[PDB]
Structure formats: C-alpha cells, structure tokens
Write an enzyme that holds these catalytic residues in place. Structure first.
Site, PDB file in Angstrom:
ATOM      1  N   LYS A  49      28.784  44.687  25.205  1.00  0.00           N
ATOM      2  CA  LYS A  49      28.277  45.873  23.974  1.00  0.00           C
ATOM      3  C   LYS A  49      26.771  46.590  24.522  1.00  0.00           C
ATOM      4  O   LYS A  49      26.159  46.567  23.567  1.00  0.00           O
ATOM      5  CB  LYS A  49      28.256  44.899  22.805  1.00  0.00           C
ATOM      6  CG  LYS A  49      27.094  43.998  22.696  1.00  0.00           C
ATOM      7  CD  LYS A  49      27.259  43.517  21.102  1.00  0.00           C
ATOM      8  CE  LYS A  49      25.908  42.593  20.982  1.00  0.00           C
ATOM      9  NZ  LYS A  49      26.012  42.280  19.584  1.00  0.00           N
ATOM     10  N   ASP A  85      40.020  40.600  35.437  1.00  0.00           N
ATOM     11  CA  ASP A  85      41.360  39.863  35.377  1.00  0.00           C
ATOM     12  C   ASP A  85      40.896  38.242  35.316  1.00  0.00           C
ATOM     13  O   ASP A  85      40.067  37.727  36.048  1.00  0.00           O
ATOM     14  CB  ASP A  85      42.131  40.286  36.271  1.00  0.00           C
ATOM     15  CG  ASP A  85      41.652  40.125  37.721  1.00  0.00           C
ATOM     16  OD1 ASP A  85      40.499  40.293  38.033  1.00  0.00           O
ATOM     17  OD2 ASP A  85      42.475  39.807  38.657  1.00  0.00           O
ATOM     18  N   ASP A  86      41.887  37.494  34.869  1.00  0.00           N
ATOM     19  CA  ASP A  86      41.673  36.107  34.900  1.00  0.00           C
ATOM     20  C   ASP A  86      40.419  35.589  34.485  1.00  0.00           C
ATOM     21  O   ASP A  86      39.583  34.955  35.399  1.00  0.00           O
ATOM     22  CB  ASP A  86      41.897  35.399  36.292  1.00  0.00           C
ATOM     23  CG  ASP A  86      43.480  35.609  36.636  1.00  0.00           C
ATOM     24  OD1 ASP A  86      44.159  35.968  35.776  1.00  0.00           O
ATOM     25  OD2 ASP A  86      43.855  35.049  37.830  1.00  0.00           O
ATOM     26  N   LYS A 105      50.666  40.637  34.297  1.00  0.00           N
ATOM     27  CA  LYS A 105      49.625  41.163  33.485  1.00  0.00           C
ATOM     28  C   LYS A 105      48.691  42.358  34.492  1.00  0.00           C
ATOM     29  O   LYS A 105      48.481  43.426  34.041  1.00  0.00           O
ATOM     30  CB  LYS A 105      48.893  40.338  32.791  1.00  0.00           C
ATOM     31  CG  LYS A 105      49.751  39.656  31.804  1.00  0.00           C
ATOM     32  CD  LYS A 105      48.888  38.681  30.765  1.00  0.00           C
ATOM     33  CE  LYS A 105      48.549  37.426  31.617  1.00  0.00           C
ATOM     34  NZ  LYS A 105      50.016  36.700  32.152  1.00  0.00           N
ATOM     35  N   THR A 106      48.210  41.661  35.537  1.00  0.00           N
ATOM     36  CA  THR A 106      47.153  42.378  36.303  1.00  0.00           C
ATOM     37  C   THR A 106      47.774  43.768  36.833  1.00  0.00           C
ATOM     38  O   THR A 106      47.041  44.659  36.864  1.00  0.00           O
ATOM     39  CB  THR A 106      46.890  41.424  37.436  1.00  0.00           C
ATOM     40  OG1 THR A 106      45.590  42.074  38.225  1.00  0.00           O
ATOM     41  CG2 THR A 106      47.914  41.402  38.491  1.00  0.00           C
TER      42      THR A 106
END
Ligand SMILES: Nc1ncnc2c1ncn2[C@@H]1O[C@H](COP(=O)(O)OP(=O)(O)OP(=O)(O)O)[C@@H](O)[C@H]1O
Ligand SMILES: Nc1ncnc2c1ncn2[C@@H]1O[C@H](COP(=O)(O)OP(=O)(O)OP(=O)(O)O)[C@@H](O)[C@H]1O
Ligand SMILES: Nc1ncnc2c1ncn2[C@@H]1O[C@H](COP(=O)(O)OP(=O)(O)OP(=O)(O)O)[C@@H](O)[C@H]1O
Ligand SMILES: Nc1ncnc2c1ncn2[C@@H]1O[C@H](COP(=O)(O)OP(=O)(O)OP(=O)(O)O)[C@@H](O)[C@H]1O
Lengths: 40, 213, 515, 43, 107
Positions: free
Chosen positions: C406, C378-379, C324-325
C-alpha cells in the site's frame, strides 16, 4: 643463473678497476704538485 | 620426412587437425594465391588443461615437425633479474634475431619458434598484483609492445601453456596475439585404447609380451 | 584524404572529423590571421589506435615520426635514462632555434605509455618529461601522441592543460561501422570474384553483435582457413589440391561454421525464463477460464485509465495443482505494459531473511521508475516459509510485504500487483487478506463432461477407449487438477495398449475425492 | 587490523658503466702525458 | 661391499623391498634387454608419516647405498633470499651438473 652471475662479477670488477684508476690519478696529481713546487 | 604416426599422440585427433587447419594452412599453399587474397598469418597459441594430459609433448612434437631454426625455450620465470631495467633487455634479446631477419630478407625469410612454459608465472593481470615493485608491469608491457608494436614483425610463432587460464590478463588474449585457445582433457575409451597400443608397440615388436594379454 | 575510409578505417568517422576540427585547424588556417602539443588515445583492446596513430603520422607532410616501444628508457646505470629522454628533443630545439616559427612539425609516438608514467628512476623520468614537454622554453612545432588501454593508471599531473590536451575514446563500432569493416576486408575478395554469391554482408552484420574489428577480421580469416583446408589432405605426407585451388569459393556455410565453433564474442549473455512459466499453453476446457480472463482485462483497464487510484491489487486463489501461476503469466503478458517482471522463490534458495527483503525491494524499486508497470508474486507461503507445526514462519518478510502492498509510487505513475497462493485461510489469519483489493477463484474439474472435453482437446485417446471412459465416468462426479491429469495420462501411457485404459481408470479411482 | 606484513624484494642498481669507464680512461690518460711534460721541465 | 644387515634398520622389510623393486630394478640389469623394452627410469620418492619412525634414516642409508657422487642436501628453506630473482637462482644451481653430464656423455 651462472649466466648472470658473470655479469655481476664483471660489474664489480670494473668497480675495482675504476677505484684503482682514480687512486692512480690522485697519486699522479700529488707527484705533479711536488715537482712543480721543486723547480722554483 | 614426417608422418602422423611417428609423433605418437593417442587421444588427440580432432585437436591436432584443428591446429593444422587454423594455423598452418596459410603457409603451405603457393604464395601467389595468398598474396592475391591479402591475409595475415596467426602469431600465437595457448594450450591448457588439467595436469598430466600431453601439452608439453604436443608442443615439442610441433617444434620437431617444422623445418626451421631451433626453437628458443623459456623454462619458467627465468627472466627476472635484480638490476633495475634488466628484465626488458632479456625479453628483447629473444626477438632481436627475428627482427634482424625480417629487416634483412624482407618477406621471404624462414620461420622462428618461441616456446613459453608456465607462462602464468610471468604475465599476470597488471592491476591485480602486490603493489610493491613495478617489475612485473614493465615486463608485461614490454612483451605486449614487442609482440604487436607499431613496427610490424610477421615471421614468428609463439606457443604458451599453463594450468590456470583465468589469471592471464585479457589484453594478451585477443585476436592478433593469441587467438587459438584450445583445451586438453581426459581421453575416452578409444583414446585409452590408442594410448595403450602406442606404449606397448616395442614389446610386441620383440615378442616380450604374453599372448594372454 | 578526409574521407576516412580510403585509409581502410570504419566506424570512427565522427571521431576522425572531431580530430580534424580540433587538431589541425590552426595549422591549416592561414598564418596571417593566426598550438596543441598533446594527444592521448584510450579504449578497449583491438580497436585500432595503432592504425589512427600511423595514419595521422602519414597524413601530415612532416618528418618521420619517432616511436618508443614500451619501456626502453630505464637502465641499471644512473642518469642514462635522463640522457636518453633528452636525446629525443634535440632536433626540435635545433630547428626552433634556427628556423624559428618557420620550423617543420615534429611528431612523437609513445606506445604503451602507461608503463613508464604512473621509484626514484620512475618519478625522475616523469619529471624530466614534464619539464621537457612544458618547461622554461616553449616549443610550438612538436606533437606527442600517447596510447593506452588502461586510462585510470595514468598520472594526473601529465593530463593537465598544456601537456596533454586532446583526449579521445575509441569504442565498439555500430552496425554501420561493422558493415564498413566487412566491406573493407571483403573488397579484396570481391575484386577477384573469389567470394561466393550466397554470402549476404547485411545478415552477418546483424548477426555479429559486439564484435570489434578484431573479431570480424578473425571471422573472415577463419572462413579463409576453412576454404583453404577444404583443398588439403594430411596424414602420410602433407599434400594439397593445386587443382580446385583455382576455385576456392568461400561459401556462407564456412562463415556460419567459423562463427559457431571457433569464435566467441567474449561478452556475457542474458537469460530469459518468462517463456518457461507457460509450457503447455492454455486450453478452454470450460467457462471459468473466460471469466477469469475477462476480469483480468477489466482490472488492467481500471489501472490504466483511473486517475485517483494509481495502485491496484488482486489475489488468485485455488486448490493445489489447479494451474494458478500460468493464468497470472498469461494475464500479465496480455497487459501489454512496458515493464513486466516475475518474483519467484526459485532463485532464492538458502537465502536468509535479509536477502529476500533486499531482493524484493530491488525489484519494486526498478518497477517504480517506469510510467505504468505490473508485477506478480507467486507461492506466497513459500516466499514467507511456512510450516503447519507451531506454526513457524518469517515475520520480517511478512512486514515488508504488508508495507509494500500500500505504498503509492511517485506522482503520475501506475502500478498493478497480482498475487497467487493456495491457502487462503492462513493468509486471512495473518491479517493479510484485508490488504488486497479483490480476489479471484480458480476451480478444479468437476463433471465428467469437462474431463471428456479436456481429453478430446488433448487427443491422446481414441473413440473406442473414450466410449468405455464415458460409460464409467458420466455417471459420477470428479475432482482433479489439470497438472495431475497430465501426470496421470503420462503415467498410464507407459504400459502396453491392452491395459492402459484399465490402469488409467484405476489411477482415477485412487485420486477420486470430493471437496 | 592487518597482521604485520613482510617487505618485498629489493632491486639494487649499479652506478658505473662500461662507456662511462671509457670516458674515465679519457680523463686519466692525459694526466700521464702532462706528467711526462712536467718531469721534462724540472729536469 | 654392501650388505642389508649393515644398515641396521628394523621393522621395514616390506617397504624397502617395494622401494628397491620400483626404483633400482631397472638400473641393475644388463642394458640390452632394458633398451629393447624401451622404458625410462623413475625419478621421484616421497616419504610421510608421524614423527620419529625412520624417514631420515632411510634417506641417509640410501645415500650411502649407491656408488655415485656425493648427494646434495637442502636443510629446509635454505634457498629463500631477499633480492629479486635469487631463489630461482639457488634452485637452478642444483641441476647444472646433471645437465652438463647428460649433454656430454649421453646415455
Ligand atoms: N595423448 C598422449 N599420448 C601419448 N602419451 C601421452 C599422452 N598424454 C600424455 N602422454 C605421456 O604422459 C606424459 C605426459 O607428460 P606431459 O609433460 O606431456 O604432460 P603435461 O600436460 O605437460 O603435464 P603438466 O600438466 O604437469 O605440465 C609423457 O610421458 C607422455 O609420453
Ligand atoms: N576499425 C577497424 N578497421 C580495420 N581494422 C581494424 C579495426 N579495428 C581493429 N582492426 C584490426 O585490428 C588490428 C589493428 O588494431 P590495433 O592493434 O591498433 O588495436 P588496439 O585496440 O589499439 O590495440 P590493443 O588491443 O593492443 O590495445 C589490425 O588487424 C586491424 O585490421
Ligand atoms: N487451461 C489451462 N490452465 C492452466 N494450466 C494449463 C491449462 N492448459 C494447460 N495448462 C498447463 O498446466 C500446467 C499448469 O501448472 P502450474 O504450474 O500453473 O500449476 P499450479 O496451480 O501453479 O500448481 P502448484 O500450486 O502445485 O505450484 C502448465 O503446464 C500449463 O501449461
Ligand atoms: N626402524 C628403525 N630401526 C632402528 N632405529 C630406528 C628406526 N626408526 C627410528 N630409529 C631410531 O630413532 C631415530 C629417529 O630418527 P629419524 O630420523 O627416524 O626421525 P624422523 O622420522 O626424521 O623425525 P621427524 O619425523 O620429526 O622428522 C633414528 O635416528 C634411530 O636412532
């Protein structure tokens, strides 16, 4: 350090010498005053 | 009258060759090519490493190698004095003779060697020190000025050793003052064999060592 | 001369011209139409201040300048320091008194001035100097130059106008200055043709970064020493060539060796890792990668061109060992934005919560400044340490992330955020999945055809073994991640060629599983 | 705050000097000559 | 006129034997063999342990052992001084006699 030990000794010895010189000068000055007074 | 063998330094071979190359090649070859090429000689060395490796031995052997005046030694902080402004006189007394020689004979004088031992006991960072007395700062400034000042002195060599290279102030460790900064370290298997052979030579000479070894 | 290079000095051309403009304009200007008595130079060591002082002294048609080598004033006796300092100004006073205005210029050099100026002796000396330089009597035929490496340690009262007026800073030379210095120091070689033809000064100038004059001259000297030793033999009795000494050519290799081994900039270095996050590249073993990349590009353009949605976020979901990374890194690098950075837990080991919060805040603050930027995390679960037992985790970091997700940046700037994880349900329970704007899914390898294609792309097995593998695999479904696949292949290749295949298949059967 | 701190070393400074003492000899010497003169006058 | 029983130290036979071997063995033998063997003597000893076990006793008894000059003794920090560069002076005053005698009489 006896190398510098002697420098300090010389310094203090000249202090003593200067003291003696000043005392001798003062005694002289007094003797001058005495003789100058006497002549009159 | 000199030879590599007679000094008796076992584990340092590349280091000594590097020293010779980077410090002494200039003063060996004929002056003609050097003058044509217009370069300057080095004026410093800084050794360091963990305790008991062979620094002082190396410095003394280097001093013995050269044919020149007897080296001057400064055993630790033997410069400090109590009367104000007296340390600087002691420091300048060291370079007085070299300055006189350079002035008199110009550019064809002999060589002079000065050995500082436990240098870090004197030349600490000027800013980072107990702000009680200014003697240390004046000493450091005097040394910096004299080693490389407006007047140019170029027939002297200074060697220094220590155990904690970090504490030395940076202004002293830049090219022109002390550039060749090597490191001594623990030997390898071959170095250990060489050292053991060195220290056992005389026994073998007089047959006082059992063959079983 | 004013060329500033006939004197063998480079880089300080602008500063030298400034000195000309501000210092000697009054003296050179005609007297009929018609001073400064203070100069202070400072800069890092080995910049050439001594050179400037010496050359300025030589340039002017005046008496020989007087110099004092550091603290040569303090004496154990009382009052002798004052007598010594006063001894310096006698000639200037005499000339001013006798010849009046028509008096020659006087130049004084204070080397390592910081030593003396900064206890009764010291402050008395400082006061004496202050009175003499600027006292009841005003002199207009004296020039004083001081040199320092530590400007902060100089007394303020000495720097007031009328005592020390012209203050100069010497800095590290630019590429042009380095080129000039190399030209100056190599002109001697080029004159006698002792230099090799293989040496390009421009290459060295580009290579030599943050080298003051000292560094460059030392490198030249080291090359000299290498060439010089090439013609000497040490061991029995030091003996030299005398034969090739005539040639003594200085090759580029000597320069490279000197730069490599026995020289160092003495400045810190910058370490990069963004390369390390994509080691084996990307291989198209199926359709999904293309879809993921296309969606990434769409999001990038939306953030780039949108007007009333300056902030956008995306989440990357997938099972473990699905790579994924790497995809996030690839998308970030394709984004082509001025500012890109990666926040990873690798660098934060043993940290408490506050340290993590502050680090994240710093990264986001830096990101805010630029016009448009992109950041990736990540993670997440490792970021907010999480354990299935209890469960247990850090609340502070979670709140920090929820707030930061946000917060629009200052007006007229754009931000993109990409998050990666492998446990969606947990994030959903913590009520964080709502914050993100959209999600993407990263699947595993499903069918034997895809596995065969991946093997073909890797090219680690030949047709013979591939035949058996196809026979065994095509009649079944598979479930494996790419990283695990590479690990398995490397595992299998260790054994002898005869068994590899069987071993490999066995391992596959061990990892055979279904979603 | 900081525990009590020790004081640093002292560096005294002698006052009199060799050359200044030659100058004091210059001072002193004339007095004896002047004394010879006054003694002569009184005599 | 020395004898081991004279010093009246008990329970430290092994330690004394080791110290004697590694310190005074070199200086007792005829010098020719030692010279051929080309070694230098040892110049250091350190003693440590819990209070009250016989350290200072060993120091004093070894002092009365050797046929040499009267030993110098430093009672803790007797060398510190208030002025600058005096402590080092008190330290360097200790080794003067050894230096001059080595320079004069050599071996
Ligand atoms: N490379 C070597 N070859 C031969 N003898 C060595 C070597 N290194 C050390 N020695 C021997 O070991 C001793 C080293 O002492 P030396 O004073 O030279 O070390 P040092 O590094 O100066 O110690 P310190 O770190 O305390 O200053 C000497 O007796 C020397 O003969
Ligand atoms: N720009 C330069 N052009 C030519 N030589 C230079 C230059 N900068 C430094 N050098 C070399 O450095 C030496 C002169 O530098 P100098 O001693 O004046 O430096 P500084 O920075 O004033 O001193 P310090 O390091 O003691 O503070 C000479 O070797 C000169 O060749
Ligand atoms: N098409 C591809 N997609 C992803 N990774 C690939 C691809 N081709 C090769 N790789 C390599 O696969 C490895 C992917 O491992 P990665 O660290 O991205 O896994 P991950 O899914 O983040 O794992 P984890 O959750 O265990 O940290 C990298 O070496 C990457 O170079
Ligand atoms: N081995 C021993 N044989 C005989 N008497 C001993 C022995 N050890 C200690 N003593 C006796 O006990 C006394 C202990 O004094 P000693 O100097 O040994 O103390 P110390 O170890 O110097 O003390 P500290 O460790 O506090 O400095 C000796 O003076 C002696 O009277």
């Amino acid at each position: 350090m006896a190398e510098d030990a002697d420098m300090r000794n010389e310094l203090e010895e000249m202090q003593r010498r200067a003291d003696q010189l000043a005392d001798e000068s003062l005694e002289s000055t007094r003797r001058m005053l005495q003789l100058v007074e006497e002549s009159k | 009258d000199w030879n590599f063998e007679k000094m008796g330094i076992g584990g340092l071979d590349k280091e000594f060759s590097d020293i010779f190359r980077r410090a002494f090649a200039s003063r060996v070859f004929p002056p003609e090519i050097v003058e044509q090429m217009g370069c300057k000689h080095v004026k410093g060395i800084l050794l360091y490493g963990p305790p008991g490796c062979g620094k002082t031995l190396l410095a003394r052997q280097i001093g013995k190698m050269l044919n020149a005046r007897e080296p001057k030694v400064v055993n630790g902080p033997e410069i400090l004095n109590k009367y104000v402004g007296e340390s600087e006189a002691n420091i300048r007394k060291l370079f007085a003779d070299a300055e006189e020689e350079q002035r008199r004979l110009g550019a064809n004088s002999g060589l002079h060697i000065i050995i500082f031992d436990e240098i870090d006991a004197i030349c600490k960072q000027r800013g980072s020190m107990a702000g009680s007395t200014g003697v240390h700062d004046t000493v450091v400034n005097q040394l910096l000025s004299k080693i490389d000042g407006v007047e140019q002195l170029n027939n002297i060599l200074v060697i220094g050793m220590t155990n904690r290279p970090d504490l030395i102030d940076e202004a002293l460790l830049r090219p022109g003052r002390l550039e060749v900064k090597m490191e001594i370290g623990l030997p390898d298997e071959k170095g250990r064999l060489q050292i053991l052979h060195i220290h056992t030579a005389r026994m073998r000479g007089h047959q006082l060592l059992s063959a079983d070894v | 001369d004013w060329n500033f290079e006939k004197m063998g000095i480079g880089g300080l051309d602008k500063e030298f011209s400034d000195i000309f403009r501000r210092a000697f304009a009054s003296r050179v200007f005609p007297p009929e139409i018609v001073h400064v008595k203070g100069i202070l130079l400072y800069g890092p060591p080995g910049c050439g201040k001594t050179l400037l002082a010496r050359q300025i002294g030589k340039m002017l048609n005046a008496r020989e300048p007087k110099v004092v080598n550091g603290p040569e004033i303090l004496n154990k006796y009382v009052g002798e320091s004052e007598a010594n300092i006063r001894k310096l100004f006698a000639d200037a006073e005499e000339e001013q008194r006798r010849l009046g205005a028509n008096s020659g210029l006087h130049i004084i050099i204070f080397d390592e001035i910081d030593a003396i100026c900064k206890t009764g002796v010291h402050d008395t000396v400082v006061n004496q100097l202050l009175s003499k330089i600027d006292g009841v009597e005003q002199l207009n035929n004296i020039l004083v130059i001081g040199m320092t490496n530590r400007p902060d340690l100089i007394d303020e009262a000495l720097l007031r106008p009328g005592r020390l007026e012209v203050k100069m800073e010497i800095g590290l030379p630019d590429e042009k200055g380095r080129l000039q210095i190399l030209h100056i120091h190599t002109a001697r070689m080029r004159g006698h043709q002792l230099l090799s033809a293989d040496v390009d000064i421009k290459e060295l100038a580009v290579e030599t970064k943050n080298f003051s004059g000292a560094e460059l001259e030392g490198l030249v000297r080291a090359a000299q020493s290498t060439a010089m030793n090439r013609h000497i033999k040490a061991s029995t009795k030091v003996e030299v060539d005398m034969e090739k000494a005539e040639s003594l050519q200085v090759t580029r290799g000597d320069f490279l060796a000197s730069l490599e081994n026995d020289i160092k900039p003495a400045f810190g270095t910058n370490q990069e890792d963004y390369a390390s996050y994509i080691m084996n590249g990307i291989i198209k073993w199926g359709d999904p990668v293309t879809r993921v990349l296309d969606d990434g590009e769409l999001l990038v353009q939306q953030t780039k061109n949108s007007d009333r949605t300056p902030l956008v976020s995306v989440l990357l979901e997938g099972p473990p060992h699905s790579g994924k990374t790497a995809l996030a890194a690839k998308i970030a690098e394709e984004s082509n934005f001025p500012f890109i950075k990666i926040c990873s837990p690798d660098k934060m080991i043993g940290f408490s919560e506050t340290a993590k919060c502050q680090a994240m805040k710093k990264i986001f603050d830096d990101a805010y400044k630029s016009q448009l930027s992109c950041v990736v995390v990540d993670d997440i679960e490792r970021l907010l340490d999480y354990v299935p037992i209890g469960p247990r985790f850090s609340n502070l970091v979670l709140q920090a992330l929820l707030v930061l997700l946000k917060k629009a940046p200052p007006q007229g700037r754009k931000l993109l955020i990409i998050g990666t994880t492998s446990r969606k349900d947990v994030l959903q329970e913590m009520e964080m999945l709502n914050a993100f704007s959209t999600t993407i899914h990263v699947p595993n390898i499903a069918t034997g055809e895809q596995l065969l294609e991946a093997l073909e792309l890797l090219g680690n097995f030949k047709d013979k073994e591939r035949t058996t593998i196809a026979q065994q695999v095509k009649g079944k479904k598979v479930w494996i991640g790419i990283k695990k696949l590479l690990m398995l292949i490397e595992m299998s290749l260790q054994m002898d060629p005869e068994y590899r295949v069987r071993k490999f298949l066995a391992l596959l059967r061990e990892e055979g599983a279904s979603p | 705050g900081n525990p009590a701190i020790f004081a640093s070393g002292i560096i005294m400074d002698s006052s009199i000097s060799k050359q200044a003492l030659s100058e004091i000899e210059t001072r002193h010497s004339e007095i004896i000559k002047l004394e010879n003169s006054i003694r002569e006058l009184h005599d």
